[PDB]
Write a protein that binds this ligand. Sequence first.
Ligand SMILES: Oc1c(Cl)cc(Cl)cc1Cl
Ligand SMILES: Oc1c(Cl)cc(Cl)cc1Cl
Ligand code: SF4
Ligand code: SF4
Ligand code: SF4
Ligand code: SF4
Lengths: 413, 416
Amino acid sequence: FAMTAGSPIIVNDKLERYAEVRTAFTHPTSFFKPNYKGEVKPWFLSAYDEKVRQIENGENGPKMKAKNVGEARAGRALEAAGWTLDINYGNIYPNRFFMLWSGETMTNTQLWAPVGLDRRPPDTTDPVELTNYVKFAARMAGADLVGVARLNRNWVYSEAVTIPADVPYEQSLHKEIEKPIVFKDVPLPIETDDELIIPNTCENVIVAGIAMNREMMQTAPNSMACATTAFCYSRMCMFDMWLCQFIRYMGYYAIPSCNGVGQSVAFAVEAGLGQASRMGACITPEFGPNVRLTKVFTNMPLVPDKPIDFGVTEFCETCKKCARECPSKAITEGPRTFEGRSIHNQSGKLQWQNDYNKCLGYWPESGGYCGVCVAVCPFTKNITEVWDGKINTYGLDADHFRDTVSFRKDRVK
Amino acid sequence: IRQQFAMTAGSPIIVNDKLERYAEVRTAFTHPTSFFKPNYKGEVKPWFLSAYDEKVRQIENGENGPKMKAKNVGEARAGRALEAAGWTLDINYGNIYPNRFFMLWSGETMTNTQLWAPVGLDRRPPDTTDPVELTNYVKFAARMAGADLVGVARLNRNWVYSEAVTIPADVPYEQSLHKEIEKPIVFKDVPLPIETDDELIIPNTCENVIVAGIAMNREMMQTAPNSMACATTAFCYSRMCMFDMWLCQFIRYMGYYAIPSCNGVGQSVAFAVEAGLGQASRMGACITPEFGPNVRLTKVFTNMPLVPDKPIDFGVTEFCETCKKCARECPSKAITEGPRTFEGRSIHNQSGKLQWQNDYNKCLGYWPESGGYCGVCVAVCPFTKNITEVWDGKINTYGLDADHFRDTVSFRKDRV
Ligand SMILES: Oc1c(Cl)cc(Cl)cc1Cl
Ligand SMILES: Oc1c(Cl)cc(Cl)cc1Cl
Ligand code: SF4
Ligand code: SF4
Ligand code: SF4
Ligand code: SF4
């Protein structure tokens, strides 16, 4: 489908769109992991067993002794709660639950129907004004970072993981299917029984960074690192809906995504949020790798942001600290290559190729989402002290929040 | 500052033997005698549909508020698009129906609770019962959940509506605004919060209310009664919803029960004054030291053992006594200039507590006229301190301000 003009990502002729089912989370060869008694479950139920084992043993992480059982119970209570606004870890099913590709059935849209903002032709078509408007709205909607790229279809999954439109939530995990994402000359995003169809007019992607909390993430791989993670996933989801509603009420269409539809790191790099790293995350100037990503696709005319260079590639060439502290040795200590390390990597793009089945393998063992690489990364800079220590709204840091102040001069040039 | 002005314990709200609990249906939004308002053409409609007509006409005429011209139709349109989108996570302006949609009184049905079922966090009895430790856990959770301010108070049932506006549980959303009913809120010796066909039953073990302040954006609010004050208001209603759900789940995963409310179930201002977030003012809001009245409230009710905070006293009553600025700026002359009394001006007030008594039907009346939620009182109040410049000016995450965001940093010392 061809690269966007000016993409920083180096690719070759082997590049092919990547089927979502191949992530270590969903793929048949990775999805099953031993629990701490040797039974092979879905990886996240094995992880559930370790989470309960730790609570019964007064631990906050793998052999990390908590103050008492009550503190161990509290960290997992806070992490479970964090996921409140997220379906089945990642909101990946397109046009289901919170990820509707059309706003028409939404309660919010129905309440506002007499105004008809979603039916009224745009009053603004100038991309400069629109970029400013949508970025203001993106920050209201909880983004700490927001960039705009031209949509590069190489990062959009060839097929999505989803459930059929008639499967209730309580059977969803047992009925996940694959479904192609195709681009057609259609007026609006539409889903048929056969296809998820993105219009050919869907020209831009808006990428949002959702800042995690450094104190909690520095506890990786233990429970409070899980908590700052889970809370950001619900913020991503609020963001996607807020922003998608705004764009529709401006007279355009918007596709939400969270962890679905496409690969966030590639979009974020192309939208100027940061650079790809050895660990594989987007490293951002404001938060390093310790930030979540979500994205919204739209036909709204916009000004694309310039990709940014602050030396991450060269730094990662000489650093290797995530690789050394990775508990599963998933992160390569070697050069970037074009050839994926296993099924889980998309071949054809120059990157540090890491073994993500080894990464996922450490989650049931540790009972968490690890994140040790993010915590030890130099761009990112006990559990009782966290609970008793500094906190602020949404886990944002006052001592840092000045850096994400935005004036129109920072939103559009 | 907050410690310098701590009162001794006991509700700061002065009452007399007349005070009775208040039926929610009496608010100016819901009561049959105030619900209808004329649109600019003179047609009588539900207040929000007349206000809708004003919104459409202002866009069409390139305005951001009542005969306030916008830079162009496009800017007028953008402001209303931002307003409408802010409300995404809110049902019918306030989430008032208890145990419906986002305000579920139990967590068992929620998708998050189902996903986490195998760990069983909400079946496991509490591993912590010490109220000091729990106050610190739930406050830290509350800040993670989007509260800028969080307080704890013993639940005062005077401020709990005697009957709630709600909808039958099997009514689809499209029909909800035509099928609102009343339903009593009663306290009984039951283990869990429970809804029957006839009652909303809060257990007698529901000892406490956790009150959350959710800060609005000062630049946008200072554009009141125009569209951008409506947008910071709308976005904070969705934050209040997410707060309620986040915190309720945390409390349940800690092994207690939790009731969310947003604008339903009871009177947020009274709870906030008793929880120590601020004091009542002439306009009738809770004025906080960090934000003035420019903050929204929501609350969660729980049997979780907690340490009540102290009510606050930083001179607001004395100041409002001689200020009268909101009363003079109020476009509908809704705010009284006189002394506080125990008798409300109309059905919309709850008599029996000493307060400034305002005409809230005059207030609602100005919302269809101006096409917004006004807020001139909040914006002009000294404790709080064009739209093209706002759109091009300072913004940060969630509309919060870096220059003041240090004021809400919290450590254990501050929480319990
Ligand atoms: O991205 C995540 C997903 Cl999809 C699932 C889990 Cl359990 C954790 C994380 Cl950090
Ligand atoms: O508090 C509000 C309610 Cl209940 C309804 C609307 Cl439409 C606006 C506001 Cl600011
Ligand atoms: S999350 Fe943990 S296991 Fe996975 S790559 Fe990073 S450090 Fe290694
Ligand atoms: S720890 Fe070092 S090599 Fe790894 S991503 Fe961070 S800077 Fe790059
Ligand atoms: S919102 Fe406006 S009309 Fe209502 S009391 Fe305040 S100033 Fe008066
Ligand atoms: S404007 Fe003056 S009288 Fe009105 S609430 Fe604020 S301080 Fe009190």
